[PDB]
UniProtKB/Swiss-Prot annotation:
Residue segments, region Interaction with calmodulin: 65-75
Extracellular side, ranges: 320-356, 401-406, 470-482, 503-513
Positions of the UniProt region annotated as Interaction with S100A10: 555-559
Gene this chain is encoded by: Trpv6
Protein name: Transient receptor potential cation channel subfamily V member 6
Residue ranges crossing the lipid bilayer per the database entry: 299-319, 357-377, 381-400, 407-426, 447-469, 514-534
Compartments (UniProt record): Cell membrane
Membrane topology: Multi-pass membrane protein
Residues noted as binding Ca(2+) in the record, renumbered to the chain: D499
Catalysed reaction, written as an equation: Ca(2+)(in) = Ca(2+)(out)
Amino acid sequence: WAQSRDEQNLLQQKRIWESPLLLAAKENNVQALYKLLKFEGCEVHQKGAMGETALHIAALYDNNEAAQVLMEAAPELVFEPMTSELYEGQTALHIAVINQNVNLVRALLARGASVSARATGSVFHYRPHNLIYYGEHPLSFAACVGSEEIVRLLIEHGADIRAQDSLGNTVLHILILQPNKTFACQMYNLLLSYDGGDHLKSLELVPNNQGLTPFKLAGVEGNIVMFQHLMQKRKHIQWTYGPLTSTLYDLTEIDSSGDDQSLLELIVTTKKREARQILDQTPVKELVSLKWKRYGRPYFCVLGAIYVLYIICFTMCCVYRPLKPRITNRTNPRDNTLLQQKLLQEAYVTPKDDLRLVGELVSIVGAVIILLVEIPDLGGPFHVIIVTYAFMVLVTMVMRLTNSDGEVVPMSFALVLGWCNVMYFARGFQMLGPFTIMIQKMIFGDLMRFCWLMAVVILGFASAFYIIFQTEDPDELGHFYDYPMALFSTFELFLTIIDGPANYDVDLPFMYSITYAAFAIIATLLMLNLLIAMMGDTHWRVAHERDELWRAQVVATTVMLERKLPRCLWPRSGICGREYGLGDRWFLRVEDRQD
Ligand SMILES: C[C@@H]1NC(=O)N[C@@H]1CCCCCC(=O)O
Ligand SMILES: [Ca+2]
Ligand SMILES: [Ca+2]
Ligand SMILES: [Ca+2]
């Protein structure tokens, strides 16, 4: 698809070269323009390859003299938008605004150009393949390019600031998505002065079609500069007392008020890395930290203590299980067999099995609640693990209820998952907090990078160890008799977790001494590289990534508790405005100091 527009741009330049009219507009050849329009009368409405006019060409190459001649010789061309699918809707005013050609904009002003004309072309979509997203309307273009002169010049002649684009985004939303934040704060504040000024229907409330006001979009986008500028509207100051300044914050669109209206939920859900810094801002970081110090951290330790007691109950119900009498003469055939197994299907004997019978009941009623609080639908893995645990005890109470021969196969998956899920609560206390973040980011990151190389390497040498020690009885030295144990043992030789095949009472094969020497050297090389490849994330920037991503996870956890927990526990943060001078809304007191 990228070649299509490249072909069409090269095709356009060919049609610019072929068409002498469009050529004179590109080169500003005013002397040639008259000869083609008067002395050898051609079509002045001559369309280009992009459905453009000679005026559309004279617009992007900033030569007003060629555009002036076309609008004087045919004032019908101004209203015409480009008809091609790439550039559909773009008038000659759009190009004049985005190129900051103020004189062409003011000349198209006198022609009565459409200020409400929508540029719906595929090159104006908010997509990665478009280098920028300036919007739909020419007023949106004037605000994004950073020309306050064109913004006011457009509003003077009927430009509607409320006009929402293809994605229902107002011009205020579009300024948040721009790069130059420090300058665009004046443009945002400038555009708001033209608003009606009524307390209702203010343009700061007109939301994106994805339910997002401009103040709320700044947080999700990670625009730290706009979010601070957008905070002064929502900031009340109680008093100034020496160096201290008790300031009262609004907390309306911030914090858990509605379902998905809360900014905090939008910050933790969005994948934007910059959005985590809105959490560290003065109005919010004081909120979430106080939501954590009280009603946040204690309940997380309660659920932690409950879960630890819930699992240590289920774990204690797994060490004590129905007895496993071999009771078969199958143990003598196939010396490899090493099992004493099975159930005898009875839990009704009522001695001390009733203690683990209610322990099994607690596990099932706990799992069905776990499966009925999570499946009704970052700390993702440590929440998928919980439902797979509940899934694994629904396969350790159903197939195990019907007397399965291998009923311990899914009980081990249930055990390690829910047990290693306890360090989910490691984000509770500060010491273990950032440590659990480091192990999680390193699994998807650096485990795959070394495991695929380890897999390719062990596959090489485990096969070369199979092929040599298949040519030998495994009664002695039999470290890898068949291919499953060939991959398993060599995988273990790779991690120094076996003594390595070593038998000296009897002689070894000729090639093992040579092959394992190369293996031990490559095994340590890849092991040292694995040690120093994950070392790369020890930079001073990562030190913040170690700490902040834990805080971001704690705040993400802090919202996870309050959203589902009842209202009687954990009251609404801040103090309500009713019974005070304010108006039934909840505000946060934060006093600081300036040195
Ligand atoms: C130069 C092209 N000729 C023309 O008349 N309009 C085009 C404008 C190009 C803008 C592409 C914006 C984008 O990348 O989406
Ligand atoms: Ca060792
Ligand atoms: Ca040993
Ligand atoms: Ca070591």
